[PDB]
Amino acid sequence: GTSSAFTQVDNFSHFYDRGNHLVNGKPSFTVDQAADQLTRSGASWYDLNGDGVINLSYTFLTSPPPGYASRGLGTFSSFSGLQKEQAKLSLESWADVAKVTFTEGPAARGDDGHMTFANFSASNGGAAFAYLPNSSRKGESWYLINKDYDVNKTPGEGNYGRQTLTHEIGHTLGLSHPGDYNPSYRDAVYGEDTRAYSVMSYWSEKNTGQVFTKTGEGAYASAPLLDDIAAVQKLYGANMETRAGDTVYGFNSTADRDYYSATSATDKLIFSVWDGGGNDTLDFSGFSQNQKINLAAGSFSDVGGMTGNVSIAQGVTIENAIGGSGNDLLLGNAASNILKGGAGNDIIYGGGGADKLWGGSGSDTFVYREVSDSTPKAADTLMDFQTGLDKIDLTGITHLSGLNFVNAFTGQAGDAVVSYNQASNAGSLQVDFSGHGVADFLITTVGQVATYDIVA
Ligand SMILES: [Ca+2]
Ligand SMILES: [Ca+2]
Ligand SMILES: [Ca+2]
Ligand SMILES: [Ca+2]
Ligand SMILES: [Ca+2]
Ligand SMILES: [Ca+2]
Ligand SMILES: [Ca+2]
Ligand SMILES: [Ca+2]
């Protein structure tokens, strides 16, 4: 057995596991499998000029292109200023993650490729459509506007008009729909075909249990989500220059993207973090609901009252996380993390590396899963430890076998020594789990630690 605080971190660390099991009766695909599914056509742009990027131009067509009239698309019209502004934000969010660049202008000798954007009015065409880069209509995307369907007239961050642009641009870059697919989620090839994993899915995140809204519509990611990032980087390479300095996501954002910025306790965030380097933070300090924040690359978090709404892209290391006033779980990664629980009763898991952990006010618990979480050459520091209030939980290591508190190691497994260094106001807990007679585990505290602060 273990304590509940360990069970909670363990279950949350595994709650969104992918691969090797069944999800809704379907095979579960890992990010990499889903990225190959999204790229199964093998279509791509080519770096025709060898400059190292796919450099594409695009036009907002102002009149019907040749061939338009025989296509049965009904009345042509051009993008409005709002559609143009939103289209460029969607383009920017693909260019952020992969070595593709987009410059407005007509087709030209130095271009790798050219794209077009326009509206059509015949409902028969669906909400939007686009073509892949190996087609004769490569670059084209098309958007439905008519008396029955106005979603595309008003794209805005978080809404379906905005995701439709990001989705159709995804096709132009070479992305398929997660499946071949009237059609419903029941036709999906793998369980993670929903709008929690890819903007290329049509199926509500409610299929896979995430909660973004009360209805399972209409809050939508504006920018490429975890599987989209991996799929597009597989085709074109990762854009490592993006956000390569220290970056904060969430409240107090320095990411400079509308979909990464929270300003209000009521904001609905749906995003996957792509970040190229530096010492970075997820700052979720502005919310009051209970949160679960996971800093593992590829993992999901339940943010701001929602679940499964924030993730970190494969290949990204995010160092720090700040919770809000709710009762939170904060899980670190293999790097040295700063984890800050804030108000409420929080459970912090540092994982690998020397972490600096802040419980904030309330009764906070610091959770340990492996001896390697906090070792004498790389020990956590519990920066605001409150003796008789906070808990150090070792139960995921001891499985409830307990510790024997001693003044020095005796060669028995489970011997532990807690000391307080008056000179530096530094507590320490050293534990010899193996029983070799020397500490194999060490946590330092700011303030004292007592035997009754330790759960084992
Ligand atoms: Ca090029
Ligand atoms: Ca960064
Ligand atoms: Ca980083
Ligand atoms: Ca908190
Ligand atoms: Ca860590
Ligand atoms: Ca706290
Ligand atoms: Ca505390
Ligand atoms: Ca650690």
Numbering used by the authors: 20 to 200, 206 to 480
Question: What are the paper's exact sentences on this?
Answer:
A new psychrophilic marine protease (MP) has been found from a marine bacterium Flavobacterium YS-80 which was recently isolated from the Yellow Sea in China. MP consists of 480 amino acids, is homologous to psychrophilic alkaline protease (PAP, from an Antarctic Pseudomonas species), a mesophilic counterpart alkaline protease (AP, from P. aeruginosa) and serralysin (SMP, from S. marcescens) according to sequence alignment. It also belongs to the serralysin family comprising a group of bacterial metalloproteases. Similar to PAP, MP is also a cold adapted protease.
Here we report the crystallization and structural analysis of native MP. One Zn2+ ion and 8 Ca2+ ions have been located in the electron density map. The MP has a similar overall structure to PAP, AP and SMP with an N-terminal domain comprised of residues 37–264 and a C-terminal domain containing residues 265–480. The N-terminal domain is the proteolytic domain which contains the active zinc ligation. The classic sequence motif HEXXHXXGXXHZ (residues 186–197 in MP) for “metzincins” is conserved in the marine protease, in which His186, His190, His196 and Tyr226 are ligands for the Zn2+ ion. The distance between Tyr226 and Zn2+ ion is 2.58 Å in MP, but the distance is 2.94, 4.24 and 4.27 Å respectively in the form 1, form 2 and form 3 crystals for PAP. The stronger bond may imply that the MP has less flexibility at the same low temperature compared to PAP. In MP and PAP, the calcium ions occupy the same positions, with one in the N-terminal domain (the catalytic domain) and the others in the C-terminal domain. Unlike the PAPs, MP exhibits a more compact structure, the Cα atom of Thr239 (Thr222 in PAP) moves about 9.96 Å toward the internal side of the protein. In general, MP has more thermo stability and is more rigid in structure than PAP but is more flexible than AP.
